[PDB]
Predict the 3D structure of the following.
Amino acid sequence: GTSKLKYVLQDARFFLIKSNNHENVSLAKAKGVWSTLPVNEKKLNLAFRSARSVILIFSVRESGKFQGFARLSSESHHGGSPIHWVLPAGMSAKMLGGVFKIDWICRRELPFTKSAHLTNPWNEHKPVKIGRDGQEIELECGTQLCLLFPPDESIDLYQVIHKM
Ligand SMILES: CNc1nc(Cl)nc2c1ncn2CC(=O)Nc1ccccc1
């Protein structure tokens, strides 16, 4: 059902993650980690302390879709296992140097055509698919966007809830 999902999404904050390639979203799904530019890293660290849940909604550029969404389970931490991100042009491993741990809530795709009815007040009420990496999505829009994804019945939200 959708009852545990709705409980996880209660009073969450939502951020749009735009990845340049599929490899890094694949790596993030396998290892439960994400990294972003320092300006977004600062915003996510602030948000993590302020809300019961911080939700990352992933979209690979040019794919026409979202590739799933995940919950921050920590602030960014430096050092540790060194993620072999595939770096876009102009990206260095230092720009992507802060590493967050994430718990996946849905690993399924959602095509942009299914979200055309949702607009984001925090981006001039443009459709929610439009936004730069790190764009915050307002509560109601973000909640409805997450509810549009196909259910991912491989994930048990019980352990996710046992972290909030
Ligand atoms: C693992 N993390 C990421 N992996 C990928 Cl592939 N793209 C990402 C990631 N975090 C943000 N973006 C979008 C982005 O900032 N692109 C970019 C900006 C400026 C110069 C070059 C490329």
User: Anything to note?
Assistant: DSSP finds five helices and ten strands in the chain. Residues 48 and 54 are 6 Å apart (CA to CA). The longest strand covers residues 99-106. The two ends are 20 Å apart (CA to CA).
